[PDB]
Assembly symmetry: D2
Homo-oligomer: 485 residues x 4
């Protein structure tokens, strides 16, 4: 078995908080209630003065992705260990299928690479980077048989991943047909391409060139465009890594307007800003380069946190895609060659608690919502995860909201040799992490093996996502006016 009894703490779910013990057996929470009995042999974790919360679910990772030709240094093994140490018990990673390549083969390739290495549970989104009868069939197979209800499309990366409006329309339509959610990288790829070419010709080769060639308008525009196409075919839409105030306002307006869309800010865009691209030290500046870029407006992260609190934005990931200082350096003479991506998987939970809860922007319950419950709802395994209740998976974190910890590349568990949150003092510390009913992290120490985590197979037509979509198919059909010829 391994039986665990978490005693003395306060359970925090999305809807409310209450004092209770949590009894874990065989991978599951089998009971929640006051003063539970300790069965002989069960380990007691003492949660007196702690919050007992669902482990974090990182909706957005790229572990060991080969990109910009090189591969991210946090791999499935180290990345998941780092997640665990930061209070995160599941990651959802993106299968980056290449143009013309089979989606199934790319899927197979990701499972073979991750299955023997994950230390926590995980699941996969699949990128749709080209279109054809074959892609259409493979998307159906993926949604019905391979446990994947999320497909990722790119409006940027011209020549590489980009799809045009007419292909987005076709792809979005077929997502709706197989009951998947459509995820979008929302930047105008034509403007990025022209922007970068122009920055280079002006001799602006540094990281400030990366942000200047694709300011937030270029994100906001594609965000609106994606919502418009999706709304036209009644397909549910998910906007990954919202980085800017204007793009977040597009999503906030579309939702007030009843559009079925979700916005996902990330740790990076909630915890720091793009003024770093202007840093005198090239290496420092290049640490922050990712697409879309962090924004030079200092009010951005606080504004994004306010919208996250208010549910204009709904859940969080990290877009963790790390490259060491010596890999970033591939672009020392040309910012278009800096491999894009920052850290976050480990620090997301503390970063959000410090910037969101300690600051008085959201309460502990909205915190649980935006770090696990909503991910589980949208990707279709709630309340299996994202909730502390009988029958749920025992992915649980004992959380100390009153103590602080400073984030540093010197004490973090990620492979990358720097940290975009370097120096930040955060209230909220994961003191014990439980994953699949086992104590994988306690007293600063990890105790877990590569392969201990499991792939989570999901069904299509997530209810949280589809109930309005289906009712609209029923009563929102356009009608003819009846006329003599």
């Amino acid at each position: 078995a391994g039986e665990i009894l978490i005693k003395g703490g306060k359970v925090v779910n999305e809807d409310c908080s209450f004092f209770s013990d949590v009894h874990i057996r065989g991978g599951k929470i089998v009971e929640v209630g006051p003063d539970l009995r300790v069965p002989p042999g069960a380990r007691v974790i003492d949660a007196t003065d702690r919050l007992v919360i669902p482990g974090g679910i990182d909706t957005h990772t790229h572990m060991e992705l080969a990109f910009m030709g090189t591969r991210a240094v946090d791999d499935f093994h180290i990345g998941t260990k780092a997640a665990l140490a930061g209070g995160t018990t599941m990651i959802l990673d993106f299968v980056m299928t290449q143009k013309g390549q089979s989606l199934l083969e790319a899927y197979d390739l990701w499972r073979k690479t991750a299955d023997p290495k994950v230390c926590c549970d995980y699941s996969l989104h699949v990128a749709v980077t080209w279109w054809s009868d074959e892609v259409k069939d493979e998307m159906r197979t993926l949604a019905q048989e391979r446990g994947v209800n999320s497909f990722k499309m790119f409006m940027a990366y011209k020549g590489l991943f980009m799809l045009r409006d007419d292909e987005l329309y076709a792809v979005f339509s077929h997502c709706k047909e197989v009951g998947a959610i459509a995820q979008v990288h929302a930047e105008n790829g034509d403007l990025i391409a022209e922007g970068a070419k122009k920055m280079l010709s002006l001799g602006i080769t540094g990281p400030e060139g990366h942000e200047l060639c694709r300011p937030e308008a270029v994100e906001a525009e594609a965000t609106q465009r994606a919502i418009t196409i999706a709304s036209a075919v009644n397909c549910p839409l998910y906007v990954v890594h919202v980085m800017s105030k204007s793009a977040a306002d597009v999503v906030s307006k579309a939702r007030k307007d009843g559009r079925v869309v979700f916005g996902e800010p990330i740790a990076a865009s909630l915890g720091t800003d793009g003024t770093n691209y202007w840093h005198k030290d090239w290496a420092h500046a290049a640490q922050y380069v990712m697409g879309p870029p962090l924004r030079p407006d200092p009010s951005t992260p606080g504004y994004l946190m306010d919208l996250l609190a208010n549910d204009d934005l709904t859940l969080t990931g990290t877009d963790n895609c790390t490259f060491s200082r010596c890999q970033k350096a591939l672009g020392k003479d040309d910012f278009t060659r800096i491999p894009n991506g920052v850290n976050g998987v480990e620090d997301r939970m503390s970063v959000i608690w410090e910037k969101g809860v300690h600051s008085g922007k959201m309460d502990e319950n909205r915190f649980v919502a935006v770090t696990s419950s909503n991910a589980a709802k949208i990707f279709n395994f709630y309340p299996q995860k994202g909730r502390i209740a009988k029958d749920s998976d025992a992915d649980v974190v004992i959380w100390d909201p009153k103590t602080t910890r400073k984030i540093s590349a010197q004490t973090h568990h990620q492979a990358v040799d720097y940290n975009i949150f370097e120096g930040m003092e955060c209230h909220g510390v994961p003191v014990v992490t439980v994953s699949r009913g086992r104590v994988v992290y306690e007293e600063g120490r990890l105790k877990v093996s590569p392969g201990q985590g499991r792939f989570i197979h999901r069904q299509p037509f997530s209810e949280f996502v589809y109930k309005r979509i289906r009712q609209r198919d029923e009563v929102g059909k356009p009608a003819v006016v009846i006329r003599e010829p």
Copy 2:
């Protein structure tokens, strides 16, 4: 006992829906799960093809209020029966304390009148219609000992209930001190007073004069003003009967801005509009007169439903305050003498389901949120009510979302002899109502006695309301700059 087993239906809570039976014993839900056993003697309600939902909680009623000198015809007895027949299992009624009168005496007077008559559970808000050391003391007593954490203040009704900005400030401050929520009637009382006087001098004595003398700008202005004062003292605010698009946009903006404020649209403003004040038939027009008025912009109710779906607005009441056709007629020659108030207590649930869920604006779960769960959170008895789960009160409705019913004063259970929703065909029918663990309504028939309902005593410092408030008291203190003299 009276044991009941609700079998075969689909439970709908705020967060998700799932197939399960519900076992009720002695006033409580004692078990929720698949295929429960029928203990000998328990009555089985067959919920096959039905939704099993928390009974509705009407946040806003005025049963048998003596006003405009006369009294509303739906009293505590008939009003609660009508609630039950419409799927609503609790009402929160307002103690309308007069100027200079003790709040405790008015409280006592309301309990004595309602206790022997309610057929469903209820609770009370208390209006603070004047200010002084005595009112200050009585508010504390009410919050700590009389089960009341909501106080109602008026920006309209000059000479009668109105408080000025400096008194709102003092009152709002003391609400925060005793852990109450501040509710506001948000209209500019000076503009109403001048507006009405002007409409009369122009010979516009009909109901169109009532709306024209206080168009929605006059509501939006006071709504902003109330949020500003409340935000200044860090007091949580609740805006009752939001009737207009502009006033709802004020609340939507304040919340995106992190203000602690809740907006409460009502059945009336979600189900019909103010074009009715322009009806040729005087009696018809006067049916709709209430303050603030319904709006002549036909897009209003749909817009309010969109904001309710998106959580710019958060919960619903009815402001049920009814006067028969012959009482309305007191103002046949002068609209200022029409006793203000419309129906809704009975029809709220069906009205919202038809306009909100059937239309594809919100799903069944957000429906539960906005008809019971949020009321229970804000007024501080969740999940005791507002949720189908073990240990919760057995206030449950078996709901048929596929069948329609037409609303008519000929078939409704309210005392009033007309209905502002006359003729409306609504999907969503309450087929069985259970209150306090007893079947009080089934097959169109009510089975309940005056006095069967209970007053619900609440504690102050509702967590849903106060957790952000208290964290802001801790880290939002303004700080001095340290200076040589």
Copy 3:
């Protein structure tokens, strides 16, 4: 000569109004002042009780355009006569160059067709419907030698006129280089194409299908996209025929944000709405079909007038492109074959005065601004036109704001056999029209010959348009951060 003295009236310019006579000689206003002398032989027009205003300038016409294969019935001859009778003294018509066809040849072809026929002054925009070194050269020639500083690009009409984002970028850049303004037809051509295909498959072949396949979101999206691309290259942008509230709000927001963009609502979208597409009578419905379509939201025209008054929108045209009832009928079985376009050239001035000035939305001076002065500023001949002052062209209208006239296809001077403003009673009547210093219209009668009007040759780099653009090229250059390697 032909000398004219306009005596006794009140001159209305964009900035103010004042009593004065206007002395016209040889095509020009040669004096403006109180009580001028009548030189022997000069004709006196008595303007007592009238406004004396600059003649209207219609920024947007398609006289006798061969399209959807057929040609509009108002040709240069009749269209300009109709303009004159409605108080409009200049039109700007679009050279609809076909894909792969020389822009110069299309220009030549338009001048040859219009020069011998116009009864009032005119000028031309040229559509850029494809891209290449040749188009690039011809645009320069057009701007420097052929009197054209406005180029028109299409985001709709896939396969026919449409340009993609990367071509818009290149085209917009070169517009800025030759000092032209970029005009855009802002609708997403991919969504229109898919929308229409879908409406047809659903058997919705009527005009309601035309609007439903491209609702206002599809306009708003392309409008934002165009502003974003234009802003990226610092190119001034002009959005033709704004038809919807949401697309007008995009332009209003971009301008508050300092973007150099102008929005042009038209008579149609200021004077009627798209509820007409739902008319039982097919012929009636099809009268209103144009791209983008009129909108079924009845508050649209009033809202557009409010933004026009407030300068969120800046000037007006008509998009006059008329087809007789028997030509519309080409699409009786399929709305995609209804030749697109409505009337307006003649009625624009009265329509705007009734809906804008009589209604109290704008004053007579803003009226002059939005019917002539702004057109002259943007297209680069102010104050040569658009102002009543010494040395300006004598294109003048004597305007009666107090009398009304009803618009009817029975009394209008347009070739088309119906009128989208049929029945409208408008305050504001053009009693005398003067064009090029000659009385071409008086007492309901026209007195003018085809060819009497002149092509107006303009220079590039309009100051109204370019002064901010050029200052931004000077101080808005992105700068490198100076770094050790």
Copy 4:
């Protein structure tokens, strides 16, 4: 006479710019045109490479006001000299009538003090700081006989100037009756009073306490409230010293909504921000104290400039009300005793040109609009001032837009011994100032005598202000529905 010929420069009016000489005789511009003849004895000012512009009109000054009991150090004599040296040729100063004091006596008192001292033209607004039959009569006398069409009301300064909503309503109504414009100090006086009391009790006595006790929400709220009351009585409204983004957004929204309201940002709020209140040096911080306060959001001045460019805000003043470092010091121990007010009269023109025109936010023509033309329109003497044209007053400035000057209390002409724009380098220098047809400022030297300026007597019912108001009285009357009893 004194004849002057300004030769060789470029005339910049509100609508366009063009090369011409300007011939001045006897106080008036008597001719504008190319290459004018120099009559024997006329002085030639060589304006080669310069802009020739209408002199600035400062809509908002308090010269030598006795306040907070002490009097401002820039008096009518020095203040107007300083204006002249900064390119400003007229000021409009406020008669600060005390509570219970006759408005006529206060008017008389201001004219007697200013008439013998002004060096440039001026006019007066009159504050209405109490209400009664007498105030009502005196307002009529002022508007019809004393040349004053602007009355100033206070929503702040409780106990001192403040009027409540019902008095604002009555006052605003009577302004509309006498054809005046209503000006408002828009802050909630109750919140200020409570805010200050609270800051003091918390030991925050420094200038940061002044801003913290009345953050921008408190301005935005009163701004909305004033617009709402004014709109209710159809009275035109003018919001003085808009200091914040949120209050400017209230005015921007009300105007898009067709409300007759004008917003007036000032030099202070366009040129610096409230972060200065947090300065370690007490004397420095207190320099910036005025009501409402400058805002600690650094994006404020740029945002206000963007709205000024876009005409969400329409014209500028300075609220010049200066107190020397040793007078400010009256509040060294309590910020409520710092005499409120900053400098600006002299620097407004250069500040706006640097921040507005050089930055590429507005062009030179919009600059003229917002520094003179709009003031003249609203207060009812355009084009007598605010325009370079025949018959206009010769108040003219020769402006060098390419040269910069640094602003410093060491080189400024104001009496006050510091400058809130200290150190700012501004493009745009007034090289020659002409007032009433005389060269009063050239080569850094002033040549003018106290009393040389004249009071400008205005008429009521300014057309720019009233034409929409009057049309709305005609067609916006509310109508009765016709009904059998």
